[PDB]
Design an enzyme around this catalytic site. Structure first.
Site, PDB file in Angstrom:
ATOM      1  N   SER A 126      11.393  12.761  -2.973  1.00  0.00           N
ATOM      2  CA  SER A 126      10.592  11.528  -3.011  1.00  0.00           C
ATOM      3  C   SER A 126      11.282  10.349  -2.328  1.00  0.00           C
ATOM      4  O   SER A 126      10.634   9.366  -1.999  1.00  0.00           O
ATOM      5  CB  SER A 126      10.203  11.124  -4.436  1.00  0.00           C
ATOM      6  OG  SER A 126      11.336  10.819  -5.220  1.00  0.00           O
TER       7      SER A 126
ATOM      8  N   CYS B   7      19.572   4.102  -2.937  1.00  0.00           N
ATOM      9  CA  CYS B   7      19.319   4.670  -4.265  1.00  0.00           C
ATOM     10  C   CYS B   7      20.494   5.473  -4.823  1.00  0.00           C
ATOM     11  O   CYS B   7      20.901   5.275  -5.971  1.00  0.00           O
ATOM     12  CB  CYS B   7      18.073   5.554  -4.244  1.00  0.00           C
ATOM     13  SG  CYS B   7      17.980   6.690  -2.853  1.00  0.00           S
TER      14      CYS B   7
ATOM     15  N   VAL C 193       5.728   3.591  -2.023  1.00  0.00           N
ATOM     16  CA  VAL C 193       6.839   2.673  -2.289  1.00  0.00           C
ATOM     17  C   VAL C 193       6.308   1.365  -2.909  1.00  0.00           C
ATOM     18  O   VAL C 193       6.834   0.877  -3.909  1.00  0.00           O
ATOM     19  CB  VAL C 193       7.615   2.356  -0.991  1.00  0.00           C
ATOM     20  CG1 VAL C 193       8.898   1.599  -1.298  1.00  0.00           C
ATOM     21  CG2 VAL C 193       7.930   3.640  -0.210  1.00  0.00           C
TER      22      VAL C 193
ATOM     23  N   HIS D 216      17.584  11.678  -8.478  1.00  0.00           N
ATOM     24  CA  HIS D 216      18.827  12.170  -7.885  1.00  0.00           C
ATOM     25  C   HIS D 216      19.865  12.440  -8.957  1.00  0.00           C
ATOM     26  O   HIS D 216      19.953  11.724  -9.945  1.00  0.00           O
ATOM     27  CB  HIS D 216      19.406  11.139  -6.904  1.00  0.00           C
ATOM     28  CG  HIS D 216      18.492  10.817  -5.766  1.00  0.00           C
ATOM     29  ND1 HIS D 216      18.558   9.637  -5.054  1.00  0.00           N
ATOM     30  CD2 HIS D 216      17.495  11.537  -5.211  1.00  0.00           C
ATOM     31  CE1 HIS D 216      17.621   9.644  -4.121  1.00  0.00           C
ATOM     32  NE2 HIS D 216      16.965  10.788  -4.192  1.00  0.00           N
TER      33      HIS D 216
ATOM     34  N   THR E  15       0.793  -1.236   0.000  1.00  0.00           N
ATOM     35  CA  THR E  15       0.000   0.000   0.000  1.00  0.00           C
ATOM     36  C   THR E  15       0.824   1.283   0.000  1.00  0.00           C
ATOM     37  O   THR E  15       0.271   2.377  -0.160  1.00  0.00           O
ATOM     38  CB  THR E  15      -0.974   0.030   1.199  1.00  0.00           C
ATOM     39  OG1 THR E  15      -0.252  -0.118   2.428  1.00  0.00           O
ATOM     40  CG2 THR E  15      -1.911  -1.163   1.163  1.00  0.00           C
ATOM     41  N   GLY E  16       2.136   1.181   0.170  1.00  0.00           N
ATOM     42  CA  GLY E  16       2.963   2.378   0.116  1.00  0.00           C
ATOM     43  C   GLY E  16       2.834   3.121  -1.216  1.00  0.00           C
ATOM     44  O   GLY E  16       2.243   2.618  -2.182  1.00  0.00           O
TER      45      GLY E  16
END
Lengths: 339, 352
Positions: free
Chosen positions: B153, B123, B13, B247, B10-11
């Site tokens: 984010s 990341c 993510v 990024h 449910t994220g």
């Protein structure tokens, strides 16, 4: 007292710094009192003691030599005279002594260079300097008012009108003198100024060349990456140095804290570090995140922030004028070295 | 085919994980979503969300975690005991010697000795490894200095909403940036909070005892593990800027052998998962806004240092939600399958 002219008065920060200056000023001339703007001409500099230029390089190149002829001491904002060997390139806290030999023009250095020099000089004078690697995080006001207005327009389009950043139309950034333009909203553009033939931009090469001249040492290795980010005012810089001798971090912090024009904002236990938004409006250069490199014994990282229009431009120019006055250097030049 | 579970479905993510899985070549016979009765799609199907528990992993072949550290620490070991291979998204298992820390283009071979958990790296680290591995394998790597320009984010949906709100308050209501109220950035779990709008914040995660942050130290330690060389010197400065997604990284290296820039360009261009965006004559370089939505890592501004003969600078950009997270994780699952490595682990090496 002095007659001070501001060329390119239409420029605003130049005026504000001059209103709060310790310079003894009898008369202000623009080329809470209304002042008429006179045309910049070849005969307009008679009786002027100090002229601060804040127009483009075109105005400085043509008229600055005529100011010197007329007896003025010029402080030039632009890049035009910076690499002329008869022109001192000065940050007052670092190399005020270079003012003594002036020939009527003192160049103000590039904005990103100035704040780095204020941060690094106190370290250099105690432990030396062998190399610098810097990555910058530069505000759009460096590219002028048009860039500021474009940035705000783009951000409003994304936020209010639902436009994706990649679909935004841009006309100025990254550079008004280059062929292609890209959005800055929610972006980081690794281009300031245009490219040279070695694949560094002119901004990056200015940090290299100007550092060497200001610290009077061609042996200091300097390589820069200059990046525009979505900030209106205040440049931030991730700075890496290697010193000649090992500089204890406690002593590096103390040296920076005592250095004129620099403020140590470094207390990570309370999340204290320089921030762009906090530096706006201030003449100081804020330094923090100071720490040793994890492997190189003489390497040190830090984070440097300053208002790009104040210490990065207008304040540095006015402070030069104040230093000229303090050192007895406000006077006519004998020999004319500019055509 | 496989039974695959997404843990933390449910994220925001979890949503990116689902998206990458939906586009995967992985032969999936069954999908399960685990979280804290509701419904989410997988392709054309409505999948009923089940509660993550110790007993919810029976018959599962692969589990992609997309929640937080506490969920991985608590439930990943029970998945391994149930016969699952776990791809974990968090930092929790990354530095465990029994756990491969994998970027598939770089160290896929490290998957072979797995003990039921493979960790997806940080990341900011992933995109650096994609750009630098083609250079390392031809000319070697002695050191790295990196300064990052990180999107919000990565701190989550709350950090995105905070950034948009702050920017609207400045531009629509005329509030000054220093008068803004912040609740999340730079770090939700730290004491003080600062505005990101029209700002650059040199703190990601919290501070460690050596005055680098955890984000910075993760780049150091994860690089060493992925490239399997503790002698690579790595120091980082990690800064948050007003970018929602993707990024960017200013990367300096020194190679072991002089690497001609034309050859470095060609090597990166030929490397899987990397895209050469380098033509300064036409102002071509990687840009955050252009990287959003792509699985690729974009490299440009490649140039020799002005003094150090083996020094090279470059500019590296990738979408932090895709290659930086969800796509790296799905790619690990695909690579596990590619190499015939989706299997139950006999010996449990993680505490329950």
């Amino acid at each position: 007292g002095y007659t001070v002219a501001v060329v390119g008065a239409t420029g605003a920060q130049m005026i504000k710094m001059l209103e709060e200056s310790t310079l003894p000023i009898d008369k202000i001339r623009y080329l809470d009192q209304d002042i008429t703007i006179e045309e910049t001409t070849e005969t307009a500099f008679e009786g002027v003691d100090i002229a601060l230029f804040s127009a483009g390089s075109s105005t400085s190149a043509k008229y600055a030599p005529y100011a010197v002829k007329a007896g003025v001491v010029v402080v030039d904002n632009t890049s035009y005279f910076r690499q002329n060997p008869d022109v001192p390139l000065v940050v007052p806290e670092v190399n005020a002594h270079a003012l003594d030999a002036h020939n009527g023009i003192i160049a103000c250095p590039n904005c990103s260079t100035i704040q780095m020099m204020v941060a690094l000089e106190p370290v250099r004078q105690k432990w030396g300097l062998d190399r610098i690697i810097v990555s910058t995080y530069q505000a759009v006001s460096g590219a002028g008012m048009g860039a500021i207005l474009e940035t705000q327009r783009e951000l409003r389009e994304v936020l209010n009108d639902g436009v994706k950043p990649c679909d935004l139309h841009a006309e100025i950034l990254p550079s008004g003198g280059d062929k292609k333009h890209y959005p800055i909203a929610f972006n980081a553009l690794p281009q300031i100024d245009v490219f040279t033939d070695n694949d560094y931009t002119y901004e990056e090469m200015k940090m290299t060349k100007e550092t060497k001249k200001i610290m009077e040492d061609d042996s200091i290795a300097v390589s820069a990456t200059c990046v525009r980010i979505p900030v209106l005012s205040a440049h931030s810089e991730s700075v890496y140095i290697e010193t000649k001798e090992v500089a204890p971090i406690e002593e590096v912090k103390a040296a920076i804290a005592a250095f004129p024009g620099a403020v140590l904002e470094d207390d990570v236990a309370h999340q204290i570090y320089p921030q762009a938004i906090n530096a706006v409006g201030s003449r100081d250069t804020f330094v923090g995140r100071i720490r040793k490199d994890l492997d190189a014994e003489k390497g040190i990282h830090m984070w440097v922030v300053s208002d790009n229009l104040l210490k990065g431009a207008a304040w540095n120019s006015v402070q030069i004028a104040e230093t000229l006055h303090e050192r007895g250097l406000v006077r006519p030049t004998a020999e004319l070295k500019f055509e």
